[PDB]
Chains A and B, each alone.
With several copies, the nearest count.
Chain A
């Protein structure tokens, strides 16, 4: 029997505000302040803004206001301490709902009829209670389904840059991310109305609104709610996937914008900064967000995060992409050079990686040649890039027969294999057959990475 308790706890209305530095509101005479506690700042105008406590002294309680500090005074601002951390009202009815960055619905609908209140921060999932994700998601993208495979329970971001079709690639995966249906929890952190409308239209056309939940924190929305949005989306995803046994496909976008929100909060707190001013605990925060995805023992559900990370200057050495690639289980790399060449999806397969490909692309799950073909394609594409550099620097006639064959392989790999176009829906087996057609350019002697048995069977 489910045990839920009726209880009324009065809340103290602290009129004492002693600092509104930046996005942080500092109280003065709080009685027993509670760390990570939701407070309501009743503005003199009348509107209330949620807040979270980030640090407590003996009597002070620094509060970060999610909706911004614009309009906050000291004389007539009263802070009401709710006494508990943020608990989003979760329910199975959230599917089909569009929420704001703070969890308040914006779909012209009623407040969600709560089935339970779950802590936003969650808890670390027991490593002994986890299951290694082995079921391979057969995304329609050939550059992903082959050479960087996605499993149910993986956290595989999309490393992109400004102007690249990361939104289009993620929407394509969402449209066609079946096994070899997926509920979607889409979190928007500071993306523009163009991207939000594209995703909403993308879901409506494909019929995903029957089973999707959106947390749209647009660029017009306050920047501090970009901190709260991914936690809300991921606790909703955790609720669905585990307590409801659904297969959630969490799609975070602008994790770089989330990290910028952290930097804005960290800079206001005057904490000791890391690289590029980012908080020294940004690794821990990003890990807390990312590691909420995976399969769990006993439960028949899973979470498959695809956080759309846009590298600021297309540099993977930036702290945000570096820590994201160190935490997550791979990355999908979108190349500005390939986009300039006109290749869609412009997935640069070399920097891209899928750590679960080794277990998800074996025999039985897919064809017996998946790993060998992927390794051979990787080796020949690297040789092609080296041969292109050699042709650019040294004369073309100096290139060997192998170099010319590898240049041809690069041309047909980028212009026929990677180039897919939207709505194409290449099955894993069809993509493997096309990859073999690519590899049939070389004589069987040159194919070193292919094992002899597979080479005899499939060549």
Chain B
């Protein structure tokens, strides 16, 4: 009887040993999915930086990326933080930005929009602008990197459906 009791304790350790290896291998597959997913987003960042390089194609990008952010602020004055590369482009498109904001919003076009002297980091921000309130208090990070981060955070289920198909376990919804 004593030997049988000792074997029971050893057997319970074998289950823990098998479970620990099973869980470790199970998280290996899950970490492979995240690593594969990170390749999707890292490749997207490379093309997002590539699209910013195309000066002609980036002109309508910064048209929307500024007016869309200004329409959320709904402030008559704004401060635009942007890369030093895009400062001239914004200075050229400022009138179009004012007209588009005044058209999309029922209010009059914003009184004064000024490009902040402090420019975005070249390594981190690869495009877009970070507009702000007149007092530089309420700001919207509308950069391409921030937009991609928001998308990668809040669009995961559709990426799952595209890549790994539907969920076999799921039955409703």
Chain A residues with CB under 8 Å of chain B are: 2, 4-16, 29, 31, 78, 89, 91-93, 96, 107-111, 113-117, 204-205, 207, 209-210, 242-245, 299
Contacts and interface: CB of A to CB of B under 8 A. Distances in A.
B34 A113 contact: yes
A2 B157 CA distance: 10
A93 B33 CA distance: 11
A92 B140 contact: no
A210 B33 CA distance: 19
Nearest to B141: A13
B124 interface: no
A244 B19 contact: no
B3 interface: no
Contacts of A12: 72-73, 138-140
Nearest to A92: B169
A5 B171 CA distance: 20
A111 B38 CA distance: 12
Specify the main secondary structure of chain B where it touches its partner. Answer: helix
Contacts of A109: 27, 30-31
Contacts of B20: 204
Interface string B160-173: 11000011011111
A2 B68 contact: no
A113 B37 contact: yes
B138 A93 contact: no
B7 interface: no
Contact of A8 (B16, B151, B158, B170): B151
Contacts of B15: 204-205, 207
Nearest to A78: B139
A14 B137 CA distance: 6
B27 A11 contact: no
A13 B79 CA distance: 14
A115 B167 contact: yes
Most buried by A among B23, B27, B30, B37: B30
B138 A2 contact: no
Interface of B: 12, 15-16, 19-20, 22-23, 26-27, 30-31, 33-35, 37, 68-69, 72-74, 136-142, 146-147, 150-151, 154-158, 160-161, 166-167, 169-173
Given A4-B157, A108-B27, A243 B172 contact: yes
Q: Which 9 pairs show the lowest CB-CB distances between chains A and B?
A: A4-B158, A110-B34, A114-B156, A92-B169, A109-B27, A15-B137, A243-B172, A13-B139, A8-B147
21 contacts: A4-B161, A5-B158, A7-B154, A10-B68, A10-B150, A13-B139, A109-B31, A110-B31, A110-B34, A111-B34, A115-B157, A115-B170, A116-B157, A117-B154, A117-B157, A204-B20, A209-B23, A210-B22, A243-B172, A244-B169, A244-B170
A96 B29 CA distance: 13
B138 A92 contact: no
Given A2-B161, A12-B138, A209-B19, A116 B69 contact: no
A274 to B, nearest CB: 37
Contacts of B74: 31
Contacts of B136: 15
Contacts of A10: 68-69, 72, 140-142, 146-147, 150
A78 B138 CA distance: 9
Nearest to A32: B74
A107 B161 CA distance: 25
A111 B15 CA distance: 27
Nearest to B171: A245
Contacts of A91: 167
Contacts of B27: 107-110
Contacts of A113: 30, 33-34, 37, 156, 160
A6 B68 contact: no
A31 B141 CA distance: 16
B139 to A, nearest CB: 5
A276 B50 CA distance: 62
A6 B16 contact: no
Contacts of A243: 170-173
B138 A13 contact: yes
Contacts of B142: 10
Nearest to B71: A10
A16 B134 CA distance: 13
Contacts of A16: 137-138
Contacts of A92: 167, 169-170
B70 to A, nearest CB: 10
B167 to A, nearest CB: 5
